[PDB]
RNA sequence: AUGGUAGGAGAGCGUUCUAAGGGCGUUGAAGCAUGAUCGUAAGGACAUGUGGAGCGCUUAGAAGUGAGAAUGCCGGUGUGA
RNA sequence: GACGACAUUAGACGAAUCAUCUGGAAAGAUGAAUCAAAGAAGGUAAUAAUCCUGUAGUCGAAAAUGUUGUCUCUCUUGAGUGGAUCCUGAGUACGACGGAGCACGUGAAAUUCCGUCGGAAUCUGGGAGGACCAUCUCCUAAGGCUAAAUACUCUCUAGUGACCGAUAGUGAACCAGUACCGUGAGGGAAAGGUGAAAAGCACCCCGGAAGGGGAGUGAAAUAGAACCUGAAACCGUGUGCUUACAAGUAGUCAGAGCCCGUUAAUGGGUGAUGGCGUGCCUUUUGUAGAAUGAACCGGCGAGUUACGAUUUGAUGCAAGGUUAAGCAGUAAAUGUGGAGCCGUAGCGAAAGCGAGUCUGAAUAGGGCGUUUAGUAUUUGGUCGUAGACCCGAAACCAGGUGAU
């Protein structure tokens, strides 16, 4: 339950403690498949229809009589079983999405933190200090620690020169403390933090 | 997204199609009259691995007739008096003993005259 | 769209703390002078929905 | 998880029945119908209820009683629900709601007898049953008709 | 000890994407169409052709998902003198 | 009004990288790099987050002026008591008779129409409010009016996405409401697809078409106008290996001649003989037709939700139930959300009573209950409403076109 906060260079700068109620479960994989399978499910626009045989251009005349002479009965030319069309069920527009209970939402983000913080994939630094924009720093920054290729990075509220910075190194995400989704955590190799972002989900998730 | 029909259809005509071949005409063209007549023979074919056993046993027990008529005896008393003899062997290997070794069956033809 | 509730079952039959339908008694309101009196009082008891009958109603009261 | 390694729970997830598709599903001609009259067809059957002309049996039960349009309800606790508080302490319907013994007080509190009240508190309710008001008392204790 | 057009709870495949991981690929990589493998499957890893720049595997999710007839419709083709 | 930013809108300029080796080239293997608000995607004989470009930055012009904090004129500091007398709206409130709309089947009717009636009141005011009189709310109805926030997008316009991927959002991404059909209203197709570069066979040789040669930009013309290549099957047609006394659901189970082996080992076969012999199929007590319907390929051809109900995984999480809408967020997650919505108690037609209650004038029996488990729940088979597994009527109605 503690963790050592590093600097900037990677040396240390001192150790800090963290609630088990947060980063210390036993994590829950059936809250979380149910939470990664929301979300994704919630990205999706349904934006897809078809048109069926009564919206099909033209055809509203039997094509011959009804006793033919050798000719099967037909009674449009935008049936569908005819090449001018007519689908019987295909795509519908529709909404994706759906809701579960707030609190396995919550169990959710803590099981996706607690697999973070079991498998040494947690590093917690005190604070950027970033005061332009510069990927190629914060690229030697990500060197001196030894991170992996995928790497989320939590600050507190809005650094905009960290954001700005660590943009598109690919590979690299950043978020807000208060913007933490499973996906994420869980898309993530390693999570770092600063110093003030670990006390604010520890204090909104315990 | 649709999925269209492309290129499934074509292998699973086609294997029946070319377990067709040899066929006369169309049936080794088309696949209708292609899958009847397959449909067909893995019928047949089902029914003919058992008639097969008796077709057999039916040509070694003709065999074995004519042999037994060779030493003035039937086959039916000739398997009877085998029996009590206590042989055991098969009508596969007493149709074979009298086509190879005419003076072995002789010998054991001896043995089934006088336990009777 | 929601379902609709039968509205002429939810006047004639109430639901149990289980889950039956007590129900009301039929041959009732009318020509009592061809009956004795056992069968006019024995009429006034009142009975459940045989479940040979919830099968067939079951969905019409729902919300009852 | 990792998202390569996703895994449902096991038993929760099934998949769905696929009607038609041939003859080794168990469902393939006519698509677990039958054969013809009113239920093979499409948008066909009963209505529910419905049993063929035979006069159905929401018909042949007559009509009864009347439906009182303002009648009164009111929240019930009980006296095992009250032993959740403390001795000399004095409930009232806010602190009922407050405590979550009540979530919605609907024409007022009613008072039941039902289990043990092995305390002794000070009560205010509209309704009181009588072995609720014996009980409260022979502990010791008042009941009060707010 | 272990059949059923109607029955329940089963393990699976073609299209797509995530949501990923990991590959085959502009000294070639396909796919697709002709090849000895896999097979009850549905469905994929090494000789001709193709080109000449596109596909697989694994796990999971979603279905314009889901291909011998309907005197079916036809881009349609072609037969039967 | 100088009214203090329309947008700072036309817009346009305006990042930063890269070279070497093996088939045309690298954008495969080596070695490097990018400069901050861009560093983000995406289109170019080879797949440049650093060629076209955006994204960031720049300045920004017509009708523009955010449109404001003095904004000329100019406002309206309200002058408090009573309601005592006057005014407060006319064929009218006001109702009968036929009808309509109100969830409500016209009625016992609180709103509208036709025809007829008529006919009030004033400070002790009168008058009005789902049958009448006293209390509550209203008006000072009919006499009258007029606000914004409140609806909605052909395609307008521009800018964007598990989407249409072209039997397609479209009938039509090609010559499309065109060929064509019909007197007319009207009906209504087929056909889409270099570029590596026409470099499109100069040149040259035998018959008009078409060939055979060379020739070529040809990294490859069986890549020749069918450069979207380009496949299959039906059908072909010319070669051949084996095969010719008969009665046929054409196969299957019992074997002389000829072969010879991949993605490899009773491999791979090929083609001759005696026995035995009835469909996707459908519909039937029963069919294989003398019952139905049928060559090959395919768009390409038969199970959503508004949204409910009920029965079969995980939990806030179990004395327990919140979120629906809304709001803030990237069309997400999520966060918040009590003016707000199932269970913990049942019984009675109901008043009501309550671990009981109804019945009974009984507190009696007997019915239905009690003697713990549910849902903020959310998510995997069957029903309901939709028009609901698909195709098919004869016909009904409405609006039109037709006496060539």
Redesign the interface.
Known sequence: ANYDVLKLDGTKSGSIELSDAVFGIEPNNSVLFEAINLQRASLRQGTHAVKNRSAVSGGGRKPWKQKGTGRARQGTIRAPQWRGGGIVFGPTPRSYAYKMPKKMRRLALRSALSFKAQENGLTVVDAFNFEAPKTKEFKNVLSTLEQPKKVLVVTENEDVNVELSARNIPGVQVTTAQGLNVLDITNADSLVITEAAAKKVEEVLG | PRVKGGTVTRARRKKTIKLAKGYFGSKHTLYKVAKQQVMKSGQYAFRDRRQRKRDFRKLWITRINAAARQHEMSYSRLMNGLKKAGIDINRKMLSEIAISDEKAFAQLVTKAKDAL | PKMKT?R??A????RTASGQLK????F??HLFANKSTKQKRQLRKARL?SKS?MK??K??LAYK | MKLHELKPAEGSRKERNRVGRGVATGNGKTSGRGHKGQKARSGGGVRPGFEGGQLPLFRRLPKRGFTNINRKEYAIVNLDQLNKFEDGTEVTPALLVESGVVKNEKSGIKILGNGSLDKKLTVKAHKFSASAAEAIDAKGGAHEVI
């Open positions: 039968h002429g079952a006047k004639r039959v109430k129900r009301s008694r039929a009732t309101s929905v009958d067939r109603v969905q019409l």
